[PDB]
Design a protein around this motif. Sequence first.
Motif, PDB file in Angstrom:
ATOM      1  N   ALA A   1       0.840  -1.182   0.000  1.00  0.00           N
ATOM      2  CA  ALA A   1       0.000   0.000   0.000  1.00  0.00           C
ATOM      3  C   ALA A   1       0.870   1.224   0.000  1.00  0.00           C
ATOM      4  CB  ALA A   1      -0.886  -0.023   1.204  1.00  0.00           C
ATOM      5  N   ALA A   2       1.808   1.276   0.927  1.00  0.00           N
ATOM      6  CA  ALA A   2       2.756   2.363   1.044  1.00  0.00           C
ATOM      7  C   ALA A   2       3.511   2.587  -0.250  1.00  0.00           C
ATOM      8  CB  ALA A   2       3.749   2.132   2.136  1.00  0.00           C
TER       9      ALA A   2
ATOM     10  N   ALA B   1       2.426   1.894  -3.193  1.00  0.00           N
ATOM     11  CA  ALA B   1       1.535   2.441  -4.201  1.00  0.00           C
ATOM     12  C   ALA B   1       1.299   3.925  -3.905  1.00  0.00           C
ATOM     13  CB  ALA B   1       0.284   1.582  -4.282  1.00  0.00           C
ATOM     14  N   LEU B   2       1.235   4.271  -2.642  1.00  0.00           N
ATOM     15  CA  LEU B   2       0.982   5.665  -2.268  1.00  0.00           C
ATOM     16  C   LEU B   2       2.159   6.562  -2.693  1.00  0.00           C
ATOM     17  CD1 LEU B   2      -0.419   5.522   1.268  1.00  0.00           C
ATOM     18  CD2 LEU B   2      -1.662   6.248  -0.703  1.00  0.00           C
ATOM     19  N   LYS B   3       3.355   5.997  -2.615  1.00  0.00           N
ATOM     20  CA  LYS B   3       4.513   6.710  -3.136  1.00  0.00           C
ATOM     21  C   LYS B   3       4.420   6.973  -4.633  1.00  0.00           C
ATOM     22  CE  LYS B   3       8.267   6.071   0.327  1.00  0.00           C
ATOM     23  NZ  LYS B   3       7.675   7.175   1.123  1.00  0.00           N
ATOM     24  N   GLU B   4       3.973   5.957  -5.365  1.00  0.00           N
ATOM     25  CA  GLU B   4       3.816   6.204  -6.807  1.00  0.00           C
ATOM     26  C   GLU B   4       2.698   7.161  -7.091  1.00  0.00           C
ATOM     27  OE1 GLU B   4       4.256   2.326  -8.680  1.00  0.00           O
ATOM     28  OE2 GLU B   4       5.284   3.798 -10.081  1.00  0.00           O
ATOM     29  N   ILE B   5       1.619   7.097  -6.327  1.00  0.00           N
ATOM     30  CA  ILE B   5       0.530   8.068  -6.493  1.00  0.00           C
ATOM     31  C   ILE B   5       1.050   9.493  -6.251  1.00  0.00           C
ATOM     32  CG2 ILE B   5      -1.567   8.923  -5.414  1.00  0.00           C
ATOM     33  CD1 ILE B   5      -2.190   5.822  -4.843  1.00  0.00           C
ATOM     34  N   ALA B   6       1.838   9.668  -5.225  1.00  0.00           N
ATOM     35  CA  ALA B   6       2.422  11.007  -5.010  1.00  0.00           C
ATOM     36  C   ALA B   6       3.283  11.476  -6.150  1.00  0.00           C
ATOM     37  CB  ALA B   6       3.221  10.939  -3.711  1.00  0.00           C
TER      38      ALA B   6
END
Lengths: 31, 30, 30, 34, 34, 31
Positions: free
Chosen positions: F11-12, F14-19
């Motif tokens: 999850a973390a 993916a959140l980095k890539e979203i950012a």
Amino acid sequence: AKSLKEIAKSAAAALKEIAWSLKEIAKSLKG
Amino acid sequence: KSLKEIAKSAAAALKEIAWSLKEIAKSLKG
Amino acid sequence: AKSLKEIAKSAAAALKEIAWSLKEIAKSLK
Amino acid sequence: GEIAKSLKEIAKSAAAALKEIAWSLKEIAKSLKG
Amino acid sequence: GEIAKSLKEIAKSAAAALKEIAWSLKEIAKSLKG
Amino acid sequence: AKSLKEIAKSAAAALKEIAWSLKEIAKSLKG
């Protein structure tokens, strides 16, 4: 647990797809 | 307390978020 | 320990609002 | 899993970020309506 | 434990990412205002 | 418990890539 696991796996996977779509948006807006 | 209930609602929201963003990506490819 | 239930509830509530706004954005872009 | 104090405060900051992201997305939805 | 110290690192990375996400969405909302 | 950690790691990530995608989107929208 199908709670700490299984649900959380589907959430994580939704996040992965969110990231893929946002990269495709970023790529389109470079366009 | 359980998280199972909450985490289910979160996961369901994130799937709807995923769907909408794929539709946005598709529209911007047009 | 299980006040994380209440925080995770507020997270899930925000995700539902996010999902709703994204639906409206998708509709506007479509 | 040892929250050991911190995980509740990290989870709090995550929830706080999501609330801000929800606000900004409402503004963006408004902007895109026209 | 290993794990506990892992979620120490992980939850921090998540929180950091969400803060960046919130900030970029503020900038996007500002840009879409005009 | 260990795997909840591995999900949370995914999850973390993916959140980095979203950012990162969102910074590129914000850059494209800047003007």
